[PDB]
Structure 1
Amino acid sequence: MKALILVGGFGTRLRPLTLSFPKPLVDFANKPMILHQIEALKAVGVDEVVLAINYQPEVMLNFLKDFETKLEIKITCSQETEPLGTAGPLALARDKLLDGSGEPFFVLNSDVISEYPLKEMLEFHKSHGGEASIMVTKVDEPSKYGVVVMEESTGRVEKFVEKPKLYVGNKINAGIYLLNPSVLDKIELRPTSIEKETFPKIAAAQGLYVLPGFWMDIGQPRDYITGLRLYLDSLRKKSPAKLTSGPHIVGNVLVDETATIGEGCLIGPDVAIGPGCIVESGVRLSRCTVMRGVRIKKHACISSSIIGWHSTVGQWARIENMTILGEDVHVSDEIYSNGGVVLPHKEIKSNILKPEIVM
């Protein structure tokens, strides 16, 4: 069985975290964003996975080569000259998707997180004998999204109603697909948006056919703190023994086995500390995320912020209000940040008392 993942570009809207590592290489809850659905593809026994990137993979070959042996999965890249809409990158990778058995392959987007029930979807495919499968999640705001008008009896879609002024539905696409090899021929050589041109072509043929979990489109660095809540919440349901606990722990916290915490601290709720970190004593972490190798000194109070790789927060420093730090950022002691988006390799010796972009 095969699979394909749509990445896109480098993650321009995720800077300064994507100034060095690309979008799928950003550590989300300890693990890079790409590992959240590759291991899920191992739950359904997918051997080979292709990436529909647009940039040069020369910067990430060392990372993808170390995951092929640890996870026992074949990982190959596909680079397109131009972004070919939404379904174009699939036309180029059709050669790496056809194994001969004519089995349906998965198509995933890097900008979405969920619980990924891929196992019980094949049974939903091998039951009625459909040709194409998509996943759908309910949203409170159907006007800001593209509404899918299906019947509530079998699961067949009919039309695409984007920005409905009146109520025609509330169910939208979730960015995860399940396509038979019999669809890779309906595409043209021209960049086609799968949401605007390809999907309506199969809906009118009535040859196609709900997500019981969380949905989040991560397209901005501030979505990492709100998207991590939905992730840790699902972890409290799936496996509650994977989240650390203790007298100094409040809420849902995902700590790494490598990370070390000092005494007299208070962490939570919704905090994720990467590996190789060094947390000193007297700190107060809340609604934040810590990436690899960064050491937080004593008596620091961090709330709802994002810490890059190999940074250093000085003693008694206060960080709050969606403060974004790049890689290797050294915050002096007693420094206050109120929403400072700092570039990597920067020493902060002044307070960022108001939202401001520092270079």
Structure 2
Amino acid sequence: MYDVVILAGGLGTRLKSVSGDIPKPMVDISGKPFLYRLMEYLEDQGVQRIILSLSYKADYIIDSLIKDNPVNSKVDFIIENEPLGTGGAIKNACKYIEASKFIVINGDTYCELDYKKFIESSLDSDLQISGVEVDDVCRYGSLDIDHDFHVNSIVEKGHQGTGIINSGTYILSKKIIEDYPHDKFSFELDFLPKFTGVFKAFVTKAYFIDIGIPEDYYKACEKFK
């Protein structure tokens, strides 16, 4: 089981048009912050080490975890003092991973994935993304993949109908991004169009919610009581 990096920076504070002040990962979900429920699930899956990449209000979040540690998994913090982007944050996290591969997850996403099966589908790739099959992919970014599940492109939200949600969860070999020439960049908009290695999707029908979507936010609160 790999180390997990959770990207909690650069997620902004809005809900649609409405701008907020609470770091999206700390939104209360029926008695517990969203980030805590995510970490509890990871611990249940066997995660032994979590790396929290933080930008906006890192201290508030740190203070929180000290006060209440929802998990016994090893937890490390990384305060980004300038916006590195999603790619820059992953590159920056590489220094702390000693193994050759690790997991990245967005901190405003909750997906009840089978991580042991995810790790196994990734053995013959240098980059693997988790995709979630749904009936209506309308509200979500989606994946355009071929009949061998090679990822051809990451598709912006807006397309209606059946589809595979871009979960933002990856398994990657550190070597592909560790020495990326830029310190600040977007993983999906800057890195992926350049990446020439084997890039496949692990596709499931896992429970998935994105807390930046109002309907999933209500769903989550109801789910958890």
Shorter-chain TM-score bucket reads 0.7 to 0.9
Change (3 A) 1:73 1:136: same
Q: Which runs of 5+ in 1 are unaligned?
A: 233-253, 255-271, 273-359
Give 1:133's match in structure 2, choosing from 128, 151, 154.
128
Q: Is the 8 A contact 1:50 1:75 kept in 2?
A: yes
| Counterpart Cα distance in 2 of 1:217 and 1:50 | 20
Structure 2 residue identity aligned to 1:158: N
| Counterpart Cα distance in 1 of 2:137 and 2:213 | 21
| Counterpart Cα distance in 2 of 1:130 and 1:38 | 26
Give 2:150's match in structure 1, choosing from 151, 156, 174.
156
Higher relative contact order (CA 8 A, sep 6+): 2
Deviation for aligned residue 1:87:
1.0
Partner residue in 1 for 2:185: 192
Q: Is the 8 A contact 2:7 2:104 kept in 1?
A: yes
Deviation for aligned residue 1:174:
0.9
1:299-318 aligned at under 5 Å gives the runs none
| Counterpart Cα distance in 2 of 1:73 and 1:172 | 28
Change (3 A) 1:10 1:182: closer
Q: Give % identity.
A: 28
Give 2:198's match in structure 1, choosing from 206, 227, 231.
206
Deviation for aligned residue 1:93:
1.7
| Counterpart Cα distance in 1 of 2:138 and 2:18 | 31
Partner residue in 2 for 1:116: 113
Partner residue in 2 for 1:219: 212
Partner residue in 2 for 1:79: 79
| Counterpart Cα distance in 2 of 1:144 and 1:83 | 26
* Greater C-alpha Rg: 1
SS at match of 1:201: coil
Partner residue in 2 for 1:63: 64
Q: Which runs of 5+ in 2 are unaligned?
A: none
| Counterpart Cα distance in 2 of 1:115 and 1:85 | 25
Deviation for aligned residue 1:161:
4.5
Partner residue in 2 for 1:182: 175
Change (3 A) 1:165 1:172: closer
Q: Is the 8 A contact 1:27 1:33 kept in 2?
A: yes
SS at match of 2:84: coil
| Counterpart Cα distance in 2 of 1:218 and 1:165 | 20
Provide Cα deviations, 1:68-101, integer angstroms capped at 9, x if missing partner: 5x632222222223322321111222212x22x3
Please give the TM-score of this superposition, normalised by the length of structure 1: 0.52
1:287-306 aligned at under 5 Å gives the runs none
SS at match of 1:130: coil
SS at match of 2:204: coil
Deviation for aligned residue 1:12:
2.4
Please give the TM-score of this superposition, normalised by the length of structure 2: 0.79
Deviation for aligned residue 1:33:
0.8
Deviation for aligned residue 1:6:
0.8
Structure 2 residue identity aligned to 1:24: P
Provide Cα deviations, 1:32-87, integer angstroms capped at 9, x if missing partner: 2112222232234333212222124332333222455x632222222223322321
SS at match of 2:85: coil
| Counterpart Cα distance in 2 of 1:164 and 1:56 | 31
Provide Cα deviations, 1:132-159, integer angstroms capped at 9, x if missing partner: 211112355557654422123x321123
Partner residue in 2 for 1:301: none
Q: Is the 8 A contact 2:41 2:112 kept in 1?
A: no
**Pairwise CA RMSD:** 3.4
| Counterpart Cα distance in 2 of 1:142 and 1:16 | 23
Partner residue in 2 for 1:278: none
Structure 2 residue identity aligned to 1:43: D
Deviation for aligned residue 1:108:
1.0
